[PDB]
Amino acid sequence: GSMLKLRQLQKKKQKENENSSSIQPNLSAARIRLKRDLDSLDLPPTVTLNVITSPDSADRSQSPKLEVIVRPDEGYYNYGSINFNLDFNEVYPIEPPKVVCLKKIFHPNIDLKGNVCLNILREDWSPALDLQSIITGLLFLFLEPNPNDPLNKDAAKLLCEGEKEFAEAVRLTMSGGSIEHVKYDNIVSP
């Protein structure tokens, strides 16, 4: 670094503290942009969203966090409920939120750790994309699963092995059943 940058950072922190003590603190660029994305949402009935931690806080340390619940009404995963946490850092929209799947599910593009392989989250991310895009992308994973980004090799294999086969494996796992020796969550309630 440089002594100047040092001094500049320290003045900035001072300003940040001042701002957090005002009534009605100014929100960071990242939080203002997330509010705008949230205010502009146009969700289909198959997707519901819960604000867990709001971009409305002035608390730098409390990252905004959303829960997104996908309940497809068609396709292999019809009527299953798959929820995701979306965690935003102060660098949105330059970086997209971190997305974590909160259920063990049998899907080629999601691993057992909750990692989700969705192109717009990395190689195809642009700051001109928005929360609506991410959410639509998560939905589309269940409407058109792709065996070509195989985080879960068993699911990727079965999808290639035909539709009746994959359909029944998905129905079993969504009801809490096991494939090979891994147990999946029951996500079919109601």
Instruction: Report whether 25 contacts 58 (CB < 8 A).
Output: yes
Q: Which of 117, 121, 141, 159 is catalytic?
A: 117
Tokens of 185: 């969550």
117 given a catalytic annotation = yes
Q: How far is CA 58 from CA 10, 22, 52, 53, 117, in A?
A: 19, 10, 15, 11, 32
Q: Please state, in angstroms and rounded to a whole number, the distance separating the CA atoms of residues 31 and 66.
A: 13
| Bridge-based pairing state of the strands 82-87 and 98-101 | antiparallel
> Position 167: which residue type?
A
Chain breaks in the chain (C to N over 2.5 A) after: none
Residue 42 DSSP one-character state: -
Within 13 Å of residue 10, how many CA atoms lie on the same side as its CB? 6
Q: Please state, in angstroms and rounded to a whole number, the distance separating the CA atoms of residues 186 and 54.
A: 29
| PDB experimental method | X-ray
Contacts by 1-5 with C-beta closer than 8 Å and gap 24+? none
Give the resolution to one decimal, in Å.
2.0
What structural domains does the chain harbor? 29-190 (3.10.110.10)
